[PDB]
Design a protein around this nucleic acid. Sequence first.
DNA 1: CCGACGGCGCATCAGC
DNA 2: GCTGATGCGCC
DNA 3: GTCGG
Length: 324
Amino acid sequence: TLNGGITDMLTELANFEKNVSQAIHKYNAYRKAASVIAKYPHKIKSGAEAKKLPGVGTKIAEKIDEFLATGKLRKLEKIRQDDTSSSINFLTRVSGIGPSAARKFVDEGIKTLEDLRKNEDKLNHHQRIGLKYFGDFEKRIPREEMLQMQDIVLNEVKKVDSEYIATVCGSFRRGAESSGDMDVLLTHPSFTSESTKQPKLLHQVVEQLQKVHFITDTLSKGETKFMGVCQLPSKNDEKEYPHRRIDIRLIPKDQYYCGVLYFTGSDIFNKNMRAHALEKGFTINEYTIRPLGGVAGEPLPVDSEKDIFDYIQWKYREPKDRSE
DNA sequence: CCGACGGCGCATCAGC
DNA sequence: GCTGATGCGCC
DNA sequence: GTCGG
Ligand SMILES: [Mg+2]
Ligand SMILES: [Mg+2]
């Protein structure tokens, strides 16, 4: 990419503030700056040029002048040398280990992959599975594999009840050639904003995917959200596919468009769009868009994703243009 | 200068 | 047991 | 860390 050196720098700074400093707004600031620079169509010549972009301020502009001048950032060079910071940053790469547990493990002298493996009894269930599939979960999923996965999920959901609709969202719906995981939006006519006319709607689908050995592990599960592990079947004699993260979100059928807007993302696109909604006097979640009175009002009618954009005076952006 | 920064599901825990 | 925080995760 | 007012 045109400015990949800079955007990598800012992402590494972002991860430092989140994982080590526990400063979530600096993390968001860095990631917003990284995103706006990533889609800037010119090779950046100076911090001043970057500062013209929204989300890039004086401090990042200075860092960008240092990086352009030398190819590196002393502040990051120092961080890479700090053992506590390096340890904490590594541990947070395990699913279920966040900034707080990472610092706690380091305190207890648990700071390497070998440390984790011989202390599995100190991990909660999520963390145990995150450690189990540590290597697999850092691999990306080719779109060709995502298509196979889509076919299995949609056909197995159909077998449970022909009235389910499963939509693959996330980066896959944005047209990405590789994804970090699979995100599945699920609806059923029995589950609306007005009534839940049938229990276990999510459970039945999860069970069926487990029965056919597609879902292999559960990280968490409730009435509307499943987070777990899945795996494509492999053919005779060939190596197994890596295990993959799968999220399933059951959304009220009448709120499909808000739900598919949310689950298509990107995460940064959602933060940008919801912030713009607020500036326009609305609030958007995965169910509704409501006016601000500063208390939310009643949900506004929505019959398309585009209706949501219209409310906040944004021209419509197809999924493939939401990769911020 | 300084308040706000998107919004929410599930797991875990503390206090009652 | 319930309620409310907090941690971690999803986009 | 950046922005808006
Ligand atoms: Mg995804
Ligand atoms: Mg996901």
